[PDB]
Amino acid sequence: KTSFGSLKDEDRIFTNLYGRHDWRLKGAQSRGDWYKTKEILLKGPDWILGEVKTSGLRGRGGAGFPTGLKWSFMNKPSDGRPKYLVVNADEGEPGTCKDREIIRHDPHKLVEGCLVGGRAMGARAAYIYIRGEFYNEASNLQVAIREAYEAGLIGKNACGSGYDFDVFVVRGAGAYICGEETALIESIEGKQGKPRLKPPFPADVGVFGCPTTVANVETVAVSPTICRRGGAWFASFGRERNSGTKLFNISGHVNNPCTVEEEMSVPLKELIEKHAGGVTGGWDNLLAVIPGGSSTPLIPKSVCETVLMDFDALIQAQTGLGTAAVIVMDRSTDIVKAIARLIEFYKHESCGQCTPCREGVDWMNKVMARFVRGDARPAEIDSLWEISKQIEGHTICALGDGAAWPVQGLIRHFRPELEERMQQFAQQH
Amino acid sequence: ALFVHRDTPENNPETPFDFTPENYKRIEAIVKNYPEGHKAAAVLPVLDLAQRQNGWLPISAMNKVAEILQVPPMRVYEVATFYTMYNRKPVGKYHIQVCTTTPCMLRNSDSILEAIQKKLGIKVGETTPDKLFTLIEVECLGACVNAPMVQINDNYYEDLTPKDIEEIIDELKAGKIPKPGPRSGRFSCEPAGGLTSLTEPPKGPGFGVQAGL
Amino acid sequence: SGVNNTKKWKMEFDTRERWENPLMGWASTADPLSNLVLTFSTKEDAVAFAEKNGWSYDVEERKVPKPKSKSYGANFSWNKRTRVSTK
Ligand SMILES: Cc1cc2nc3c(=O)[nH]c(=O)nc-3n(C[C@H](O)[C@H](O)[C@H](O)COP(=O)(O)O)c2cc1C
Ligand code: SF4
Ligand code: FES
Predict the structure, then answer these.
(1) Would you say A190 and B43 are in contact if contact means Cβ atoms under 8 Å apart?
(2) A404 lines ligand 2 (CB under 6 A)
(3) Are strands B133-138 and B94-99 parallel, antiparallel or unpaired?
(4) Contacts of A93 (CB under 8 A, 6+ apart)
(5) Nearest in space to A108 (alpha carbons), one of A71, A175, A159
(6) Residue A83 sits at the chain B interface (C-beta within 8 Å)
(7) Helix, strand, coil % (nearest 5) of chain C?
(8) Is A210 annotated as a binding residue?
(9) Distance between CA atoms of A389 and A393, rounded to whole angstroms?
(10) Which 3 state secondary structure label does DSSP give A65?
């Protein structure tokens, strides 16, 4: 294969993405959910982990780590502590709204994924951490969980397999940092959402100090279908090491902003015009695209022409797939103001635990505010670049990196705009 | 917003607060979700329940949550001041929360914010003198493809225009509650002007199941 | 927290009277050794120097911080009291 991105409906996983069919148990079963769940559970964790591995699935939460290998850290003899699966539904990355649709329109896929993924890990229960703003979405998930409990699909003797499994829903209280896996765990434990240093890794010491795996909603929700249809089916989509289908969010300056499922490695231009109805004002009006949520560096129009949407392709473009949330900016956008607002976002979300982000991100925010008005000198651009490199790789968690990268992207591709603004301000003062 | 507490007549340790008997039943179910020996895990949900009953959190509410769960009061103050959804001072009946991050900013969230300020006659961060509405800005609310949008209490209102947000305020001001969701014509997150995928009937149980299962 | 000043051995002498100068209130002294501090690489060097100079001396053994057992993971213990309530 050389071309990707004409996914057929029969190959789509989230078939109620738009909520046009009954999201409840009766509709979910009619669409293939919960089918032969007992057989999957009886195959054993090694078979389930084997399927997840051969599918080439990678983390859909933004970091893209191989799921099969990650989940295998939990396949070990019990040492007396309970084992837990924590499903990350915090969905805080600006531009990203995919996990919201799964939770409210395909909740039973997430619940079944919790049971199947939990079985492979040997977990006794799944804690679903959903952000507190998603109140109606959380209630839908709770309604679905009650339906599954009453049909015996979860709880004692889940699906008749003799495996006891509970699914808990825990709501956040308004913190983007609580999407970070260790901050999420600390939040579940009743503390501030401040990340943990590693080691220990969560698979050894996690929620309540117990072996734990944190998985994104989308990563979990697809696992039952990978088991039913097989890893080879999943691995037949997208490039090698970039397998499967993916939920994309196309927001910003597009004619029809939308969420859609498409194959991995589809061209970015193909995605924006086939599904979102093209760029506002046409493709020639495109200025820049943030390809994977606010934490991934922007790329200009030239790069957008032929870049594919997968982990490897976007890395070579000096960015990343991230959450696959595409934010589109046309030529009428104040690009400096757009990025400054993201830095302001990271300033408001930093937990404040560690020095480079507590002080550095707030510092970068102040510099960006002056850059928007042009009230600076060109020498400060290289200073700002150097400051961002002192944050990246020196913080406890990746929020520090996620604040540096947007700044680096702007300087990389839009330095003359920054310098032009400075000239205007100096000319007028 | 300040992250230190100063006692006042309206908010001090002797300010009256207790959970209703029904809310004590809900607290018991919350605490049972966690392993024995780890009751501090219930601080966030129980603290939020105290806010759902009282509307906001007086220091006496924080002290009660600490007392019930047997955690030091300071550890509850830490949570209350860390998470933005906790209201540590009174808010209006309708807490309007306008997303102004870049995906929403690109689709003209400033016009929504100006429309609300003009209608209510208040600035961002203020409460109306009638104490019906409080207005603030917030970060991404996880509905970027439906920008611009606001959240009022528990409900999202999306795909907004200045006209649309004024009607919602007029309905809340008139005692009614408007329906949540997009106001542009579409139902949720599907592309406008017709679906581009999921146009065929979904397959049934057992479709594409691998052999040997 | 720096430990660089705890590397060498020292020799000081017994503290003697200081009084207030009547004119200014400055601290006066009659002890010519009041500021004498000597440095030595080892305890034996210091003791040898005191002995040949005829000074009666007291030696106090070097206090070394005991090696500790540290573990960041212990902050999140499942069943032990080492679990921290805040970060
Ligand atoms: C600031 C920050 C916010 C994050 N938010 C989320 C999130 O909302 N949802 C998510 O799945 N992962 C989020 N992550 C990534 C998680 O830490 C983690 O990598 C992921 O949940 C692992 O699950 P996965 O392997 O299925 O992707 C965030 C990371 C950081 C640093
Ligand atoms: S990088 Fe920022 S958010 Fe992450 S632990 Fe440090 S201060 Fe907290
Ligand atoms: S940027 Fe407003 S909902 Fe995401």
Answers:
(1) yes
(2) no
(3) parallel
(4) A62, A176, A179, A293, A294, A295, A322, A323, A325, B140
(5) A159
(6) no
(7) 20, 15, 65
(8) yes
(9) 8
(10) coil
CA distance A269 to A279: 9
Q: Are B210 and B170 in contact, with CB atoms under 8 Å apart?
A: no
Paired tokens of B3: 């992250």
Find the ligand nearest to A62 CA: 1
Q: Which of A194, A209, A353 has the CB atom closest to C76's CB atom?
A: A209
Residues of A whose CB is below 8 A from C85: 191
Integer Cα distance of A118 and A83 in angstroms: 9
Residues B84 and B193: their CA atoms lie apart, in Å, by 37
Contact B78 C79 (CB under 8 A): no
User: Which resolution, in Å, applies to this structure?
Assistant: 2.4
Q: Is A82 annotated as a binding residue?
A: no
Query: Which method was it determined by?
Result: cryo-EM
Q: Which of A304, B18, B38, A361 is nearest to C77 (CA)?
A: B38
Q: What is the DSSP letter of A212?
A: E
List of E strands, chain B: 94-99, 133-138, 150-152, 155-158, 181-182
Torsion of CA B29, B33, B35, B37, to 10 degrees: -40
Q: Is C83 on the interface with A (CB under 8 A)?
A: yes
Give the Å distance between the CA of A348 and the centre of ligand 3.
14
Q: Is ligand 1 within 6 A of the CB of residue A222? A: no
Compute the distance between CA of residue A52 and CA of residue A222 in angstroms, rounded to an integer. Answer: 10
* Cα–Cα nearest to B189, from A280, A330, A104: A104
Cα B171 to Cα A387: distance, rounded to the nearest angstrom: 49
Taking the C-alpha atoms of residue B169 and residue B183, their distance in angstroms, rounded to an integer, is 14
In this complex, do B75 and C79 lie within 8 Å of one another by their Cβ atoms? no
The whole-angstrom separation of Cα A262 and Cα A231 is 18
Give the closest-approach CA distance of C82 to chain A in angstroms. 11
Q: Give the whole-angstrom CA distance, residue C49 versus residue C55.
A: 9
DSSP, residue by residue, A145-185 = HHHHHHTTSSBTTGGGSS--BEEEEEE--S-GGGGSHHHHH
Compute and round to an integer the Cα radius of gyration of chain C: 23
- Give the separation between CA A402 and CA A294, rounded to whole angstroms: 8
Question: What are the counts of helices (DSSP H) followed by strands (DSSP E) for chain A?
Answer: 17, 9
The tokens of A306 are what?
A: 């032929």
Q: What Cα–Cα distance (Å) separates residue A164 from each residue in A124, A154, A156?
A: 7, 7, 4
- C85 contacts in chain B (CB < 8 Å): 40, 71-72, 75
Spatial separation of the C-alpha atoms in residues A212 and A342, rounded to whole Å:
31
CA R_g for chain B: 22
> Among A181, A295, A357, A392, which is best to mutate for testing ligand 2, by the most ligand atoms less than 8 A from CB?
A357
Given ligand 3 and candidates B101, B102, B189, which is best to mutate, with the most ligand atoms within 8 Å of its CB? B101
Task: Report the C-alpha gap between B161 and B183 in whole angstroms.
Answer: 8
Q: How many whole angstroms from A89 Cα to the centroid of ligand 1?
A: 9
The amino acid that residue A407 corresponds to is: V
CA-nearest of A382, A392, A380, A362 to A295 is A392
Single-letter residue type at B148:
P
Task: Select from A100, A93, A101 the least CA-distant residue to A327.
Answer: A93
A183 C-alpha vs ligand 2 centroid, how far in Å? Answer: 9
Helix (H) or strand (E) holding C11: strand C9-11
Q: According to CATH, what is the number of the domain A25-236? A: 3.40.50.11540
> Which two three-digit tokens encode residue A203?
């698979």
Shortest-distance Cα residue to atom 23 of ligand 1: A215
